């Protein structure tokens, strides 16, 4: 049973920032960290870190406020996923990104109690290393082409080119220059509009580039706009920002609106829901990423554990903010991308050993 | 231009509570108040008050947290609706219920500057008084039928019966008993499932009651569930909780998914978006309410002003929390439901005079590029 | 790691048989049992038992033949769900009902290794006891109404009336008589057509009985037939036999073809897929059962463990063959329906202790890269 | 009336194997042979041979087990197609591939009794020779191009290129190299994904190759995925693996989901159902093949007889495993591909004379 | 090989006529008979007989004209179904009702050559006797109810009530009176609108009679009209006149437009196409009849042979003109309805022996590449 919950926040400056996105650039991020303490004194860590306040319907102050409400009613709840989510949903409607942090912490605590990695609790890892993909922030076409080649040479299996908040002509220039730089290396390519394109411009982006094998990731602002362009674009379409619940995913998958997903653990509400999402995609043969918005070692561990349980043929990559984060929470064991790939942790829980005072005194504590 | 913004919270205990909802009951509510101060010293007031944390994706602590972000980036902005919303959207994605409070305050400030009521700024009132509807919490069928007749007798033109969080047969019993009590009085009837029914049970509710003239208000948990039952229910269907943006409303109206709406000002993001919603419903001949989740005189004034601008034949009623709120913010001018109807305010702005210290010291304030946690 | 796999078959005569189904009656059943032995000597048990050879695309000889293929390729594999299913799918396409038995055994082994009940591995039980439903075989209308009241009186929360293989007017007579016997008791009612009705007759069944609150469970023979009647029937529609994979379930739920499911663990391919199914139904607010075709304590334990993890408002009941099965495999711990409900096991794994020789010598065994026909 | 049923199995090593398919490669196949004996002592032969256990929901041990159940309840049934299927369906739900073998045997027995070829019983042959198509197993792009030209020169009217279980880039390379080798010869081309492609990759396959006139055969894993790509691919789409019943075919044909079919006799449940399938396709002007999964002379004869009754303009070819099978069951008369074409048998029944002991003693016999 | 083809016409006055149809009444009918003679002297007989010139796109003079074209191009062709239809389609587009007669004759010849009944060539009879249905012409409601009971008492398993060419209220009166007379007897009921109803009136017919278990057979004039009413009628809908080819049937079955068919052998183009139709309906679990427009023993034998091959639960009945036909072509073996059922013939071919001069001298004959108008 959960005995105590502590909340903290921590600044994560963007190494070589800003990191530039159609829906809003970021210079520094404020992560929200949860520590759950069981009646036996063992602890589990969780984390949620929105990519600033305009990427999605989520912000650092919102995480903390929601987590205060959740934490205030969670003492005595069983530290297992279904009992946890049952209690959380009785306390607060929605706020998946906040609930995610407590879900992560429960999986950490559960794995530590049973002496198994989180990937075991999620059904069993299929691999001991996972692929990643690199995200090029919005930048000059020439710089994107340069960095694309560089990251291919580092060993990334896939590259995501962020686009938008500028004329579509320049986005098309950027994707052509990137493709010219990396064609024949076999690296996979995603064009991410981050909700930034009118249907007018998304139609043009696809029409002009039949022989560039990108997938279009969330080109347009709404689910309905994805529906508008779907029958008129011969390139694959992925959902990202619109995938705000398992219910909405089921609507998209069942109607074959999309060919795949960028999926964030916090958006969907934690590992409990991410594992259902994984199983949905496996049933439907839909590729997907295993990401979160941002974060340090705790988020990185959560993504890596779930990524390890995905059929490699469907796993498009686990993106991590790690390259943009200066300091590990666990200096020796924190997950890191090496050669464009990530080693799966094999110790109990998330595989982290973080000093209970790593983040200073709690901002809030319940029980 | 906005010179300063102050945020407050205030407790509103429910008069004769609790107020019982299928998605979660409420005993007492924390409202979040905004005061905007113009460079010239004039003030405008706004308010947002979720009905606890489980009724919608909204809570009092979330209102405050979002308003801190918004307030921190608003000094210097023009107190006009479109400039305001452009700025707010650049500072924070979504959180309509928080943005609503600043929108209301801006409309108050703007009306006071020009010397006209908010209803004028919204295009002009079509009436000096508006209809309301009474919402029966979930309660025993027999208690429901009694209270239904009582409220019809008070003069309410419409009754909403809250249902759910119990077997469907009890909901059907309750709607039948209510109908038996009020049939022949001409009172309009809504059956509010509060997102609480499976499609199984929504189908049964309609199927068993062809001769009871309810509309089914948000019977099921999702937009997709509304789509499922729509072709299979011969009773009118209204959207409420799922109407989370103008975009989503346009998707529903354009596809004729629904025959009307329960609409809350906070959910849609303030009066600027409510006025667009009104115009969309007028174009589509779709009836709607003009409500909010909860609140005192500031929210009630906002709802009444927009309600006054709706063609009465399409205005299903402005529901107010006022009967459940113990104290007015403005004892002279605060809106009250009288005989099931509401008199439209005629002063400048929202038509309220509220002491600048009515809610105590601020919790938070922003002036220029600085902010202060008090 | 899996060291050895043994296969057995065992006869289960129907207590007071036959058990009468529209797609084919059953007098006695041959169950197929799997025992997995870990390198450390711990054992896990699984089971699959078709209701004869005509109820589904499944039969006892087919279970054994498929398990021989699967078992022959499984030594050395990790006894974890995802590794197991990846391996099984590489050895044999489809045959979910066979794969289910190995899935169950793996969950038993895994729970025993970690010292926790299967319901914990499935995310955590939400309850210490689960509801059940009673299934009335096809029988005279008058016998049906009598037995319906009898089973309501025992405490069952739900009754399934099997129908078909006779004129539709007799099915309608039977559902009306049953309803007249139990109406007012609050017991839920399902009308199971067992794939046996033409669309002609399904339309009539619903059309004639608007005030009888049944759900129609798999009235017709195909997915396409469900699609045909869906827009024309105002009663809820549930899928059963057509739910042959998670993919197909997603097609049905996503298009709102159905309002719920009868689901069998063997049909969907084991607990790993049942847990996904549960999560899909939770996301879509779709009620479902947690059943299997037939079986003894191993199947019954599997169903009860998954059932314990479902929100009670969406769990239509865990049907067990247990009342029709003469003998327990584990006399101490084998699950029994008591007062129409089932106590959730709390021991490690499935919560069973079954003698390694309970089913006699193996018919087949695999260890490493060798197999043996006994 | 049927007096006795005997079951046998027989090994068929793949000549120059393995034979390589996206859904699973095969090195040797185990066929299941049925002999029905009438009350007058005359016999009919049937056969079913899954292409290993992961191609479809079918396997050699499953055939035998199902056939045991069927055989155990078939004594006394009339040896005519509708009475047979009526009895079989009363004994066992589904298992079309098993039922197929008994159906074939009944057509053989029926033709022998009446002294007419099976093609007469199926409505009358329209031709005395039929076209075939050759199936290139998954192989290197260069090797495929080489073998494609070779098989065109042998006289095949159509070539099927098996693809998948590798990056789509290589599949596209393979089809372009094949097309470069055979363009202008007029040979028809099919690209068979064998369920191996995500919708992402099937969209790309078509988009990149508008001027290569392939049909895409079962590119994706499910019926729903075929539905997803149909409005977004300007190449013709054929169903193969998803055509598991006449009911499902009717859904696909009636909704114009597909432009044609790869159809296997065993999948659809025998010649009785294949002849209905033929008539459906004729009504809808949909081309189709006349195939089975694998097998020796008995299967080959069944395919050839039904193929002979198809309007040549709609008959895409009868594929036979015969080139991969070392030994005929009937050395003198077993059907064989010659010059890419197959001579239609003209004797009674299937046109086979097989020693009653050709396969050794029965594994099982009923009555 | 076909050596010679002879064509005849013969008058069939309606016994106790006229026979009244919404699309046009009939007093007497001209049948068109084909005799095919094989190179070896064996003969096969076929027949086609429209119900006058306004019931369908077909008439006796058109049958003869089309048969002259077909016959002129058929000498030397193999008397097997697929070779025949390939040849016929190369000579003349459409005219199924004419082609049917040659198809029937070929099946007769083929059966006689092999020494087996036509039902064997069609895959094997599943029964030694088949059900029939009686068709009540349009008549006063009271006369309809009387005759309905009379025919139920004779043993008919199903009754078709012809309707239309009068106000819909009279049709509704008639179906209600009929139902009141036969309800409780278990007799199946079809309401045949004969293409005669506007969608307005079809909607009313169904709407007013939810508790009368008719199927609506071809209520409206077009395929599009069936599509219009389908989503708005809770009674089963059957296609008849619109089922003009296998292609069109596949369009209807595949889209679940209908729940069954009235099917005529001549309309679909003969037994080869009827057998395909049967197999399509079996795959889709769609009930159907096995009828033809009119005719004597040759048509009746054809219908009975195909009917014998249909699963009895899907065979709604083989309607025959036989009760309205004064004279048999074969007095010994001609099929007769007895107790509402028909005994399946068991001789070779159609099971008929008809004198080669039964219909007088030929009107037309073809041998080799020559033809003769007599
Ligand atoms: Mg993205
Ligand atoms: Mg005025
Ligand atoms: Mg509401
Ligand atoms: Mg417990
Ligand atoms: Mg209706
Ligand atoms: Mg069932
Ligand atoms: Mg195009
Ligand atoms: Mg293929
Ligand atoms: Mg016979
Ligand atoms: Mg008719």
Curated annotation (Swiss-Prot), chains A, D:
GO biological process, one term: amino-acid betaine catabolic process
Cofactor: binding comment: Binds 1 Mg(2+) ion per subunit.
Listed Pfam families: MR_MLE_C (PF13378), MR_MLE_N (PF02746)
Domain of life: Bacteria
Gene3D superfamilies registered for this protein in UniProt: Enolase-like C-terminal domain, Enolase-like, N-terminal domain
Residues of the active site: 162, 264
Cofactor(s) required, per the database record: Mg(2+)
Matching InterPro entries: 4R-hPro_betaine_2-epimerase, DgoD-like, Enolase-like_C_sf, Enolase-like_N, Enolase_C-like, Mandelate_racemase_C, Mandelate_racemase_N_dom
Family that this chain belongs to: Belongs to the mandelate racemase/muconate lactonizing enzyme family.
Designated name of the protein: 4-hydroxyproline betaine 2-epimerase
Organism of derivation: Salipiger bermudensis (strain DSM 26914 / JCM 13377 / KCTC 12554 / HTCC2601) (Pelagibaca bermudensis)
Lineage summary: Bacteria, Pseudomonadati, Pseudomonadota, Alphaproteobacteria, Rhodobacterales
